[PDB]
Design a protein around this ligand. Structure first.
Ligand SMILES: NC[C@H]1O[C@H](O[C@H]2[C@H](O)[C@@H](O[C@H]3O[C@H](CO)[C@@H](O)[C@H](N)[C@H]3O)[C@H](N)C[C@@H]2N)[C@H](N)[C@@H](O)[C@@H]1O
Ligand SMILES: NC[C@H]1O[C@H](O[C@H]2[C@H](O)[C@@H](O[C@H]3O[C@H](CO)[C@@H](O)[C@H](N)[C@H]3O)[C@H](N)C[C@@H]2N)[C@H](N)[C@@H](O)[C@@H]1O
Ligand code: NI
Ligand code: NI
Lengths: 281, 282
């Protein structure tokens, strides 16, 4: 439990920073390689995070009204996709030049975003088990990254309101009998790892982007504030990793499909139902 | 290269078409051969009734393939990419869903491994020499990692040293030094000569009815067919569930037995016929 993002994991940026100088990029990649998690503070304008926060809080009633509310492991951790309306699809969020500079260097120039989702942590939420979002590709084998989660807090994350617990360096661990069918870490391996490299939790100011190995051990924790804690979630994969495409309206096709910052996208005529995924074509 | 009179014993498991399963010792030997050498020859797997129909169908299609404006060719003249027909009458469970093949690919790639290729290589008389290449790259440069794909090659005639039996580089499937491969999967000549000194390539006859299973990363090349008859090969490739591939187009008249199976196929089922006569030509 820290007062701020630890300097060992953190690069302090401004929203005007378009690309890292070679020394900054080398430090960014050294942090991801060693720790599996990188915090970039001050990247997104409050204008963008304000609109995304508002849109997801406005959508929450429609999510909670569903017959079965999609939940991550335990009560209060709701899966919620942000809107894919043209007015809420921002190049600086989907196609951030600093994020893609980092993901291109780790995953290659053909790396592609294939997730546009979110994690709404409700007041009174329960403790998640420690897990990874994406598995190792073979059991018992050491291999490099094939995916980088890109997490965008939409309010100030604090120790009180459910700032994620991260397990530094856990992204390289893949012993036999380590993971169950839900990507939860088997308790024996949790405790062995805790003795060598215990987890961390820290406040993350809104405007930050967290880039982490998709294999990093982490868990959502109780939100003990009065307000829901929204996170917007993206994940960059190597070109060769099979993912369903992100459904986007064809009104963003002009700037999404042009880019050398690739998205695995399917462009739809008219509006996408971002909550039910249940539009006709 | 080393020119042999038969498939070498070190790379070969002799079966009959009645063999539905390898006993544990045979399976262990099969996996040890794939791990060490990256290529396994299984003789006597397919009935002549099946290979006769597939051979006939591909030779009958060849005129229509060669009549096209732009003939899909692998690297050099005479190595033609040709899909076998996906008519229901020529789609055989013992070819698409072979129990011995999937026993081996399940053990190497997992129970979720899937066939995502149903294609072919027609080697024409007077064909040229291909450069040495791999069909599927390593997933990261400079890194050692296990297999993610197994090519399943079905000769549709007897392959001989004369009619273009493939050159294979045994043990080459684990080699991934920096700056080894170009954008077409060709091996840098400097790495070819370093490797040749330690483990030279081999060419050998393979009788029709055989199935060749090899690491998709194995170094190989098509060679000149010096006979007067085209040399047809039917080609399939099993991949880990997580490797992105376009689906095989199949008619919905095989959906009942293909889509049921615990021998997975990455398939898109179409109403009516597929026009099989190219995305896999390099
Ligand atoms: N950080 C972004 C998001 O990450 C997780 O979603 C992930 C899944 O974890 C992953 O699934 C993997 O894990 C499961 C168990 O290992 C397997 O069934 C599955 N076959 C395997 O590919 C999908 N491929 C992609 C999806 N975006 C969280 N739930 C989600 O709330 C969060 O926003
Ligand atoms: N043994 C079966 C077949 O294998 C090869 O075809 C392969 C391609 O090689 C492969 O492509 C890979 O290698 C390319 C060339 O470098 C890269 O561009 C590409 N990114 C990379 O995925 C495709 N994915 C699948 C296709 N079946 C031969 N060509 C073909 O004649 C033969 O019948
Ligand atoms: Ni998670
Ligand atoms: Ni080839």
């Amino acid at each position: 439990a820290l007062a701020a993002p630890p300097g060992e994991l953190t690069l302090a940026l401004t929203p005007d920073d378009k690309t890292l100088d070679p020394a900054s990029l080398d430090r960014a990649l050294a942090i991801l390689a060693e720790h599996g998690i990188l915090v970039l503070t001050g990247m997104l304008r409050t204008r963008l995070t304000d609109q995304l926060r508002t849109a997801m809080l406005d959508d929450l009633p429609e999510v909670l009204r569903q017959q079965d509310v999609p939940t991550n492991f335990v009560p209060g951790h709701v899966q919620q996709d942000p809107p894919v309306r043209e007015s809420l699809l921002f190049p600086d969020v989907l196609l951030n030049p600093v994020v893609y500079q980092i993901t291109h260097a780790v995953l290659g120039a053909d790396a592609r975003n294939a997730v546009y989702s979110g994690n709404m942590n409700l007041p009174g939420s329960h403790e998640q088990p420690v897990h990874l979002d994406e598995p190792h590709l073979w059991p018992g084998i050491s291999h490099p990254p094939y995916c980088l989660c890109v997490d965008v807090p939409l309010i100030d994350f604090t120790l009180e309101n459910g700032s994620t617990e991260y397990w530094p360096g856990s992204h390289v661990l893949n012993p036999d009998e380590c993971y169950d069918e839900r990507g939860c870490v088997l308790p024996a391996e949790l405790e062995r790892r805790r003795a060598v490299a215990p987890p961390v939790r820290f406040p993350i100011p809104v405007g930050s982007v967290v880039i982490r190995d998709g294999r990093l051990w982490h868990r959502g924790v109780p939100n003990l504030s009065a307000a829901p804690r929204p996170l917007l979630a993206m994940t960059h994969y190597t070109e060769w990793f099979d993912m369903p495409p992100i459904q986007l309206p064809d009104t963003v096709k002009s700037w999404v499909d042009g880019s050398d910052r690739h998205t695995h996208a399917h462009f739809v005529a008219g509006d996408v139902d971002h909550l039910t995924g249940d539009h006709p074509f």
